[PDB]
Design a protein around this motif. Structure first.
Motif, PDB file in Angstrom:
ATOM      1  N   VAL A   1       0.825  -1.194   0.122  1.00 56.99           N
ATOM      2  CA  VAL A   1      -0.043   0.072   0.029  1.00 56.99           C
ATOM      3  C   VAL A   1       1.009   1.126   0.058  1.00 56.99           C
ATOM      4  O   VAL A   1       1.590   1.445   0.972  1.00 56.99           O
ATOM      5  N   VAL A   2       0.867   2.033  -1.107  1.00 57.80           N
ATOM      6  CA  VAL A   2       1.814   3.036  -1.318  1.00 57.80           C
ATOM      7  C   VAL A   2       0.845   4.594  -1.567  1.00 57.80           C
ATOM      8  O   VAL A   2       1.121   5.404  -2.039  1.00 57.80           O
ATOM      9  N   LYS A   3      -0.584   4.549  -1.024  1.00 57.08           N
ATOM     10  CA  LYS A   3      -1.099   5.537  -0.963  1.00 57.08           C
ATOM     11  C   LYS A   3      -0.337   6.817  -0.393  1.00 57.08           C
ATOM     12  O   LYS A   3       0.419   6.505   0.504  1.00 57.08           O
TER      13      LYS A   3
ATOM     14  N   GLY B   1       9.523  -8.657  -4.204  1.00 59.07           N
ATOM     15  CA  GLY B   1       8.660  -9.829  -4.327  1.00 59.07           C
ATOM     16  C   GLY B   1       7.040  -9.275  -3.957  1.00 59.07           C
ATOM     17  O   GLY B   1       6.398 -10.316  -3.938  1.00 59.07           O
ATOM     18  N   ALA B   2       7.022  -8.219  -3.675  1.00 56.07           N
ATOM     19  CA  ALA B   2       5.320  -7.760  -3.960  1.00 56.07           C
ATOM     20  C   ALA B   2       4.917  -7.986  -5.109  1.00 56.07           C
ATOM     21  O   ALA B   2       5.261  -7.787  -6.265  1.00 56.07           O
ATOM     22  N   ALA B   3       3.511  -8.543  -5.173  1.00 58.20           N
ATOM     23  CA  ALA B   3       2.873  -8.766  -6.433  1.00 58.20           C
ATOM     24  C   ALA B   3       2.197  -7.643  -6.810  1.00 58.20           C
ATOM     25  O   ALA B   3       1.895  -7.603  -8.193  1.00 58.20           O
ATOM     26  N   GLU B   4       1.560  -6.690  -6.148  1.00 60.49           N
ATOM     27  CA  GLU B   4       0.602  -5.829  -6.406  1.00 60.49           C
ATOM     28  C   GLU B   4       0.986  -4.609  -5.708  1.00 60.49           C
ATOM     29  O   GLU B   4       1.670  -4.678  -4.666  1.00 60.49           O
ATOM     30  N   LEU B   5       0.294  -3.354  -6.144  1.00 61.65           N
ATOM     31  CA  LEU B   5       0.356  -2.230  -5.744  1.00 61.65           C
ATOM     32  C   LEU B   5      -0.992  -1.676  -5.072  1.00 61.65           C
ATOM     33  O   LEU B   5      -2.025  -1.772  -5.897  1.00 61.65           O
TER      34      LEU B   5
END
Ligand SMILES: Cc1ncc(COP(=O)(O)O)c(/C=[NH+]/[C@@H]2CONC2=O)c1O
Ligand SMILES: Cc1ncc(COP(=O)(O)O)c(C[NH2+]c2conc2O)c1O
Ligand SMILES: [Ca+2]
Ligand SMILES: [Cl-]
Ligand SMILES: [Cl-]
Ligand SMILES: [Cl-]
Lengths: 371, 373
Positions: A31-33, A52-56
């Motif tokens: 989470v990069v909000k 290795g994070a899959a998504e944002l």
């Protein structure tokens, strides 16, 4: 630099790897909000994905489009949409959209028809926060609309999501209740002939402390930045990634009995030496820190004295001096060198470290240490 | 179609500058626009203040001065906070006035005059009691001897003597008179040593409005330019706060008695009611400590915040009366108060700070916008 918020991307990497260990087989959505909670969404995202994070995950389509404009191609999900939003640009930029009402779904479907682009949809349901999630009674109508939209290739039914009432209290039974309500939402979907690809409920606190409540994905924010999701537990093996520091702009002599800064709220009990630090509350140094914070200078704690001004404050160096103009003062960091932490500021101000790290700005230039 | 905005009414700025000029009497006015105009926009406020009779602009840093110059401002700009070892050359080449607060800083400035061949328009910032930066009485004689030699070779023009008041908000306190007398002593020392400063200025907004007897050649108000009272206990002092922070209602929803709202369920509905979601939060400058304390104005009515303020949103209680709010309606967080909305001072009271900090807080999703005079 006058002052800087240095983001150690090595710490970001470490934290993401720690979070992946806790998540087990669940994929990780970083989470990069709010511009990466003040750490820089794009740089944190790049580092998190590389670790290795899959998504944002972000709040707004605007935040997702900014990542896209910076070259990010990984999946990005946005879940807070103002009335009147045009979903068209999100669709054309391969941004996933979480809808939280039938009105939003209808708006998204009109945008699908206009752009010719199938929406990769997530549904955000309320399991207790009582903010913008879809409620239980409205869920079936949304499922029916989604299933009909899926039956004509207008949407891909990617996700079901909800969010926890406690960011910092993994032992509270509301965590368990939310997970049970989430399972009940999935049962409703089954009854209406709808299957989501993935379901996700977990914030940082749940990811690290309630693995028994993990669904298919985890959605950690605060822990990516190294800040403890359960402060009473200590650092939980994480390393806070932001260090706020600034140069000593002036060293000045004070005689016993002299007042300092506005109102003379501090009067020197002894002859001593002060350092002027040229950042203040317009730069994110909460004014309520006045007379309570300490900084680290050349390995020593130096307490703030007098009021924090808009663009400067004073610290007491004590009575021959070991500090020179241009030396570095650390306001907060991971604590490795004995400096205060963002949690220390949170304790002094009566807030949480989330708010501390979204504060630095102005003269505090954001910089990056590579991993 | 903005989600939220900090609307700066430039007609209010104009009004406030005309009020300050009346109080200034025989003195000219330097509008303080540091910290990006106290969050209101340094350049737009500067242009308006100059058209409403401001003679000069004051900022903290040379960087702030260069930003004004880059935006086409040609009026006098004085900068008074410089890091050690600064290269003053860019300031000199951009016609930025420099206030020096030490002999070492004067030496840095004269080194830059030598390198560039450009005369420095110098102000001396003296310490009359604030004990922050500023030249002390012990060093001032040596400063005067040095400035005299620099002036003789046209390395400096000796424009200004300045100092700053210990109290931003208590004009009655005797320390104000003490500081003004110490300031006169600096001026007398200069005159006796044959060093002529063109102008002297001591007065912030408080002194300008409430202590005309302490006014020298210029006044140097900041907070009152933005319409915020320099003496809150006296009321608005005829000024109009120029910033209105507002946002669009993102969601209206009903809730049931006994349901909790937001993180930790710190608020539990005592009755069936309607809520609105406002899509700005503490990362946008809505102080988290406002939670459960602040009110917003929506369609003329006060609506209290309920539950914790989140990073990017918070909830307000519309009450169980007939629903008079729709998604997309305007919620005012603070403003001048003309419509019954809270003021920045109200926020300051709720969280234990000053409105100076309130107006330097809005950011993020709160886009700065302008209403022309
Ligand atoms: C040298 C000088 N001269 C005039 C003003 C204008 O002061 P005000 O009229 O009270 O806004 C300021 C601004 N001082 C800010 C206000 O908040 N804290 C500060 O340090 C200043 O530094
Ligand atoms: C939908 C969603 N999913 C995961 C996270 C990550 O939560 P966390 O791991 O606790 O940082 C957040 C972040 N929420 C907040 C942080 O501060 N105020 C907030 O409202 C979120 O809104
Ligand atoms: Ca309307
Ligand atoms: Cl949300
Ligand atoms: Cl919700
Ligand atoms: Cl000196």
């Amino acid at each position: 630099l006058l002052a800087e918020a240095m983001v150690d991307l090595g710490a970001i990497e470490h934290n993401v790897r720690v979070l992946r260990e806790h998540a087990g087989h669940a994929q990780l959505m970083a989470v990069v909000k709010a511009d990466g909670y003040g750490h820089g969404a794009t740089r944190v995202a790049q580092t998190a994905l590389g670790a290795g994070a899959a998504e944002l995950g972000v709040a707004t389509v605007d935040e997702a489009l900014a990542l896209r404009a910076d070259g990010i191609t990984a999946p990005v999900l946005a879940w807070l949409h103002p009335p009147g939003i045009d979903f068209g640009p999100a669709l054309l930029a391969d941004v996933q959209v979480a809808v939280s009402s039938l009105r939003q779904l209808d708006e998204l479907l009109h945008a699908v028809r206009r752009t010719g682009r199938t929406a990769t949809v997530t549904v955000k349901v309320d399991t207790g926060l009582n903010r913008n999630g879809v409620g239980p009674a409205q869920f079936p109508a949304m499922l029916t609309a989604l299933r009909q939209a899926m039956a004509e290739d207008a949407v891909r039914l990617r996700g079901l999501m909800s969010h926890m009432v406690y960011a910092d209290k993994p032992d509270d039974s509301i965590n368990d209740v939310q997970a049970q309500r989430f399972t009940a939402f999935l049962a409703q979907a089954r009854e209406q002939g709808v299957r989501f690809e993935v379901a996700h409920l977990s914030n940082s606190s749940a990811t690290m402390a309630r693995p028994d409540l993990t669904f298919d994905l985890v959605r950690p924010g605060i822990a990516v930045y190294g800040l403890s999701p359960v402060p009473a537990l200590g650092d939980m093996g994480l390393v806070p990634a932001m260090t706020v520091k600034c140069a000593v702009a002036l060293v000045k002599s004070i005689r016993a009995g002299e007042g300092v800064s506005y109102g003379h709220t501090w009067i020197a009990p002894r002859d001593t030496n002060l350092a002027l630090l040229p950042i203040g509350y317009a730069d994110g140094v909460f004014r309520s820190l006045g007379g309570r914070l300490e900084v680290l200078i050349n390995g020593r704690r130096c307490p703030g004295v007098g009021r924090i001004c808009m663009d400067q404050f004073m610290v007491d160096l004590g009575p021959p001096l070991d500090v020179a103009e241009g030396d570095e003062a650390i306001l907060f960091g991971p604590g490795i060198r004995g400096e205060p932490t963002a949690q220390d500021w949170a304790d002094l101000v009566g807030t949480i470290h989330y708010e501390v790290v979204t504060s630095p700005r102005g003269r505090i230039t954001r910089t990056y240490r590579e991993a």
